[PDB]
């Protein structure tokens, strides 16, 4: 078992709020395979100059996805 | 000669064809036909 | 590992320095056929 | 019997480099790849 270290002493976690409304915000973009998108290169071997089918792990053409953003804790004036 | 002319396509279409009767010849012996490798010599490395 | 969960992080900004963060876009992977063009230096920037 | 880790300084020869085979046709086992090959210097092209 590697060390991590110390685990943290605080007695209780940050509270942590949740809003729907507030994180109800949806900009989703579509995978453009014309665009590279998502496109892994292959470990095994590199290509140059030609244009072939490869099979390989890649995310569906026009899938908008999943969609998680991250935001600010609330605040009041200087302290978090 | 254009893209439109009929007797110009048929020219490059007798050319076309010779080309990939030589194709294949190329492509066939990449083709694994089920074997673990397309080079024999690399087979022999691999397998007993 | 069957399961995935995001953690989500937040950012402990003064109400002055908040900031807008840069939504990830999170896209399953799946095996499918891609026809792949390379260019010289063998990277990709178009597929099907 | 089966494993030799420690192997002494320099276990690779010239004769095992490309370089001193370059231009002449010549048998390749390079990483798990088995072919008779020649191999000519020339501008690096694909992912290095």
């Not at chain 3, 937040?10 to 095996?31: E, G, H, N, T």
């Not at chain 4, 192997?7 to 231009?23: M, R, W």
């Amino acid at each position: 078992y590697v060390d991590v270290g110390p685990d943290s002493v605080k007695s209780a976690c940050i509270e942590v709020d949740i809003q729907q409304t507030f994180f109800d915000k949806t900009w989703p973009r579509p995978i453009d395979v014309s665009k590279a998108d998502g496109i892994i290169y292959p470990q095994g071997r590199t290509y140059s100059n030609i244009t072939i089918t490869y099979q390989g792990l890649f995310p569906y053409q026009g899938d908008h996805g999943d969609m998680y953003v991250y935001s600010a804790g609330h605040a009041t004036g200087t302290t978090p | 000669f254009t893209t439109t002319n009929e007797a110009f396509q048929k020219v490059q279409d007798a050319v076309n064809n010779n080309a990939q009767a030589l194709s294949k010849l190329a492509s066939e012996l990449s083709n694994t036909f089920g074997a673990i490798s397309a080079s024999i010599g690399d087979i022999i490395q691999r397998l007993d | 590992i069957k399961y995935y969960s995001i953690i989500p992080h937040s950012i402990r900004s003064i109400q002055s320095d908040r900031k807008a963060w840069a939504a990830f876009y999170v896209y399953k992977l799946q095996p499918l056929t891609f026809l792949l063009d390379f260019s010289v230096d063998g990277y990709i920037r178009r597929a099907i | 019997t089966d494993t030799n880790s420690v192997c002494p300084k320099l276990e690779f020869a010239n004769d095992t480099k490309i370089a001193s085979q370059l231009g002449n046709c010549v048998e390749y086992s390079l990483y798990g790849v088995s072919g008779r090959g020649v191999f000519q210097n020339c501008t690096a092209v694909g992912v290095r």
